Symmetry: D2
Subunit: 115 residues, 4 copies
């Protein structure tokens, strides 16, 4: 129900081995760790969570773009790219969070489908 896809606009390729950390806002208003992983050779990260665990809430997907660019000899502008959204508040949905990265820019979108 939660997938992350990352592309590299400089290379025209998937962004491989990009660390992703997901957090969920807790009752006390702090960000609790929720899931993490690294993107594959296709720039995809699957298997973060299950429909049982992915309850309603406010989630933050942090994509470690600085570590990515530094590993290729680019000193980038952003520390990371952060996507914050309410999920599942009208029931379960499937979310794809996609990001396109450049050293001084990024764009992100969400595709939200109803299984």
């Amino acid at each position: 129900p939660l997938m992350v896809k990352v592309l590299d606009a400089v290379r025209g390729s998937p962004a491989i081995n990009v660390a992703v950390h997901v957090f969920r806002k807790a009752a006390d208003d702090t960000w609790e760790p929720f899931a993490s992983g690294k993107t594959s050779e296709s720039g995809e990260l699957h298997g973060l969570t299950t429909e049982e665990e992915f309850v309603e809430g406010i989630y933050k997907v942090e994509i470690d773009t600085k570590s990515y660019w530094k590993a290729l000899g680019i000193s980038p502008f952003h520390e990371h790219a952060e996507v914050v959204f309410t999920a599942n508040d009208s029931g379960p949905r499937r979310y794809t969070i996609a990001a396109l990265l450049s050293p001084y820019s990024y764009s992100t979108t969400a595709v939200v489908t109803n299984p």
Copy 2:
């Protein structure tokens, strides 16, 4: 030294009256308020800080996109748009952080010039 510009991809216009909050990362790794404002009729926010105040450090610019779309009657995806970056004295002096907003997407870039 720090300007923010916000544009609306649905209406093809500046994004007017958008709240923007800027934070600087503190010693204890929390985010301390630094500056804030609302974008003007041109979608710009100027006069956030001064050169003296804007020292090297990690800054977060939070744009209240959710309120913006709600005001237009449109249901958005994001709670806000975040832009987190290090200000470094070596690089050029003036930072423009621009954001292009759609309900389920945003794009941001930095223009860093002398």
Copy 3:
């Protein structure tokens, strides 16, 4: 070897039933029709061409964004989105042309892989 993917930034969904026309620059410098189709329920258009037919050249992928938005009651800004690129000039590659659409904006990227 040539795939097109289209997303809608307003809805947070694939852009379905979007017409796509591909042209190849001919010897006389005119644009020759090459392939066409419509995106699926997943916002994807596969099966445009074959590795045999997709020779070196300059290609134009025209995405009929105006027809798309008009069909949803938006009067959009652009007539279409056009992506023009040299393909296969160092041998065969696989190309994904992706576009993210808003009424007054679009973004496009290419993912280019070597089979």
Copy 4:
């Protein structure tokens, strides 16, 4: 009534000295040259046309992105970036066409204001 602004997502700067050609769709459905220029040090191109000349019609703005990246020593994907749109008198009067360039991607938006 028509301005173009081009930014570079790799360097975080305006895209300077970029050739821009503008065409208007003619009676016979071909593209006739209308205006052209090179972006300034701020990545902007002003003074393309006048209100009198810029009548309703279909216009194409072609940005020579390939030459821009080649000049920087970078191998790009696109031959150019194209933006094709109708100018309509009902809508606001001033059109800004902005483009954010990367080697394998570009984004464009229209800011249409009065």
